[PDB]
Amino acid sequence: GMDKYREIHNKLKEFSPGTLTAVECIDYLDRLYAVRHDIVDQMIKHDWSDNKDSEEAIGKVLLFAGVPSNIITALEKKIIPNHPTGKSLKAFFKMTPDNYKISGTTIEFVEVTVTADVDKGIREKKLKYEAGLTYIEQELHKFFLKGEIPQPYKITFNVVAVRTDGSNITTQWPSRRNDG
Ligand SMILES: [Mn+3]
Ligand SMILES: [Mn+3]
Ligand SMILES: [Mn+3]
C-alpha cells in the first residue's frame, strides 16, 4: 500500500529531498482510507440507496418517509434514553448516516466504516446511531397507537465495515454479523 508511495517518493529526488516521514505516511494512509470509504459508499448508492448523491440528515429522511412535519417537531424536545451523551432528537435529527432506503414505512440505514478493527468500527457506529434510531421507532409507534399517524414505522441500522487492508468486509445487521 505505502510501498508504492515509498517508491514514488524516492523518485521525486530534488522535489522531495527529505526521506519519507512516519507522520506523512500516516496522513497518506488516512487519505487512502477515506477514498476506500467513499468508493464503497458510492457502490451502495449506485444500486441500493435512495440517496444517490450525498448522505442525508435523519430528520429529512423521516419527512421523505411520510412522517408529518408536526410529528417531527414534537419529537425534537425528547431526550434519547440511554444515549452515551444524553443527546436530544433535535440534535440527532441533524446527523447524517451514509445511506438510507425507504420501503413504505420501513426505513433502512447503512453506515460505511473503513477500520483496522472491524469489531471496534462497528461498535463505534452503533454507539453513534442505534439508541437514537430505536427511540425514534418507539416514539413513532406511540403516535400510531394514538391514531396520529396511520401506520407505524420500522427503522433498521446496519454497518458495512471495510478492512483497511485487503478485500474483506463485515456486515452487521441488527441481530447478526457476517464477516466476509
Ligand atoms: Mn520527502
Ligand atoms: Mn458519512
Ligand atoms: Mn461512513
Residue numbers in the entry: 0 to 179
The study reports:
Segmented negative strand RNA viruses of the arena-, bunya- and orthomyxovirus families uniquely carry out viral mRNA transcription by the cap-snatching mechanism. This involves cleavage of host mRNAs close to their capped 5′ end by an endonuclease (EN) domain located in the N-terminal region of the viral polymerase. The sNSV cap-snatching ENs belong to the PD-D/ExK superfamily of cation dependent nucleases. We find two different kinds of endonucleases, one with the characteristic catalytic histidine (His+) as in orthomyxovirus and bunyavirus, which have efficient endonuclease activity in isolation, and a second, without the histidine (His-) and conserved among arenaviruses which shows very poor activity in vitro.
To demonstrate the presence of a cap-snatching endonuclease domain in hantavirus L proteins we determine the crystal structure of the isolated Hantaan virus EN in complex with Mn2+ ions and characterize its endonuclease activity. Each protein binds two Mn2+ ions in the active site in a similar fashion to that observed for LACV and influenza. The active site of Hantaan EN structure is configured very similarly to that of LACV and IAV ENs with two divalent cations bound in a canonical way.
